[PDB]
Design a protein around this ligand. Structure first.
Ligand SMILES: [Zn+2]
Length: 256
């Protein structure tokens, strides 16, 4: 096991974290390869009914929501996935904590929805295989008012403040935690951003952000406890070198 912002350096315990094709990465849109074959993402089953409830847990490194069977995500022909869980990465008071960056810019927080390829019946079989797992990532930014979809989760953090504690939340519209623009995104091949840092993961990063109130962002970053009696904050990995990888863009970056 392992921690953010301190020893042991991940390769000392998970050597695969020293791989060449790790995540997250710094995205530079003017250098991304424009790929018009990347069509709008397609989701189905994400609008969940209130029952059954979903497991929400503080695992010491993030807050993780377990997703039920039946959520489908298609990146394109031959690339169909089932969603497994989502979790978040964040900073601290006045300090951003997203995992991916854009031209070196770090955003307040980031959401990851993790999926299993329909080629595989179990996560174990997919680990390390190219395209075995896919993650949808979106940046969380500050907007003027409360995000009602996020409030259904964020209002439940207080009761799972202790590391290892868990609770149950009503079904909600998972797609409402994501951007509304499904057409504009970046895509590349990388790794899990925690040990064991397994490679072969298809990363799709929305260009559009989602807006949370400043109060919500403080709730996310200030409520949970991690290992020891440290606050669960700054739970992101440093960006990793591309090492020749090409990041694709589904849209024309543009001008400015
Ligand atoms: Zn993550």
């Amino acid at each position: 096991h392992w921690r953010y912002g301190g020893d042991p350096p991940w390769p000392r315990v998970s050597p695969a974290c020293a791989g060449r094709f790790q995540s997250p990465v710094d995205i530079r849109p003017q250098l991304a390869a424009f790929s018009p074959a990347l069509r709008p993402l397609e989701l189905s089953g994400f609008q969940l009914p209130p029952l059954p409830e979903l497991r929400l847990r503080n695992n010491g490194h993030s807050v993780q929501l377990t997703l039920p069977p039946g959520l489908e995500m298609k990146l394109g022909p031959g690339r169909e996935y089932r969603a497994l869980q989502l979790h978040l990465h964040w900073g601290a008071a006045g300090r951003p904590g997203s995992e991916h960056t854009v031209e070196g810019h770090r955003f307040p927080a980031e959401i990851h929805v993790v999926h299993l390829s329909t080629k595989y019946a179990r996560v174990d079989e997919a680990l390390g295989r190219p395209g075995g797992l896919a993650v949808l990532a979106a940046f969380l930014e500050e907007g003027p008012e409360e995000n009602s979809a996020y409030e259904q989760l964020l209002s439940r953090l207080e009761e799972i403040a202790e590391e290892g504690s868990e609770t149950q939340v009503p079904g909600l519209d998972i797609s409402a935690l994501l951007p509304s623009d499904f057409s504009r995104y970046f895509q590349y091949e990388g790794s899990l951003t925690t040990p064991p840092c397994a490679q072969g993961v298809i990363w799709t990063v929305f260009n559009q952000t989602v807006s949370l109130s400043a109060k919500q962002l403080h709730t996310l970053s200030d409520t949970l406890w991690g290992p020891g009696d440290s606050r669960l904050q700054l739970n992101f990995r440093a960006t990793q070198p591309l090492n020749g990888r090409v990041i694709e863009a589904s849209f024309p970056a543009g001008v400015d």
